[PDB]
């Protein structure tokens, strides 16, 4: 199982947000900690992506692009998984030092978004998603959002995405075709469900960046740049998710 071996081997470890849990909750402290967590996880997503089979055959500008567009979805999906495995989706396990209960979901001013993320987490339970299905699905999320005008070398991206879909299908293949078919259907629907969540978070973080000075929310270096240059391309429709099913 060469492909699964690799994904297992390269999977990032635990990342802490640096949140002070000894202090009372506030919108500013929670969001500043989430922002710092995003920066920390981005460092890990880059190291991971570089190690994915075939990633480096992409044009370097395209490597940059897929990372810059896909991080929100990737990170939401991984957080959904952590939440499922660590706390049976009861709370949102952003990091060991940043676990959102309902009060934090309210104080963060992201309650509705948190609801959807917890629903995603529950799906891993409801669908009985395996660790190996999770790994293949997460890898595929890196290749699920691109410019409508295409990438620099679209053909190499298309080939890579194709191969990650095939690896997912293999990990699903059940000597009964109907079982594998229903399963692939379910998992592709679940992958699609990440995108509207990521989009709502894109809008929220962009709006927050625009007003960050007014609410005492800190955005680290890479996050601020990505959210001001790359995220607006998503929000303006220049960059769109790749859906399996018609929305």
């Amino acid at each position: 199982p060469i492909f699964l071996n690799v994904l297992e081997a390269i999977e990032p470890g635990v990342v802490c947000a640096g949140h002070d849990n000894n202090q009372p909750d506030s919108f500013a402290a929670l969001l500043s900690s989430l922002n710092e967590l995003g920066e920390r996880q981005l460092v890990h997503v880059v190291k991971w992506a570089k190690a994915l089979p075939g990633f480096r055959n992409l044009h370097v500008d395209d490597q940059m692009a897929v990372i810059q567009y896909s991080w929100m979805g990737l990170m939401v999906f991984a957080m959904g998984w952590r939440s499922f495995t660590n706390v049976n989706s009861r709370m949102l396990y952003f990091a060991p030092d940043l676990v959102f209960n309902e009060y934090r979901m309210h104080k963060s001013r992201m309650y509705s978004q948190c609801v959807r993320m917890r629903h995603l987490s529950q799906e891993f339970g409801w669908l009985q998603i395996t660790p190996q299905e999770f790994l293949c699905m997460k890898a595929l999320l890196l290749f699920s959002i691109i410019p409508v005008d295409g990438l620099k070398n679209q053909k190499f991206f298309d080939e890579l995405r194709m191969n990650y879909i095939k690896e997912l299908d293999r990990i699903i293949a059940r000597k009964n075709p109907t079982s594998c078919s229903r399963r692939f259907y379910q998992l592709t629907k679940l992958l699609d469900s990440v995108q509207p969540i990521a989009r709502e978070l894109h809008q929220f973080t962009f709006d927050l960046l625009i007003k960050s000075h007014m609410v005492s929310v800190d955005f680290p270096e890479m996050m601020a740049e990505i959210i001001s240059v790359q995220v607006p391309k998503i929000l303006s429709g220049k960059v769109k998710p790749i859906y399996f099913h018609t929305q």
């Binding site: 981005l42 880059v46 940059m64 990372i67 810059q68 890479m222 990505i226």
Partner: peptide, 13 residues
């Protein structure tokens, strides 16, 4: 051109 991100992509470390 995100310099910090490109640096992370370019560095081996």
């Amino acid at each position: 051109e995100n310099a910090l991100l490109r640096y992370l992509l370019d560095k081996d470390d």
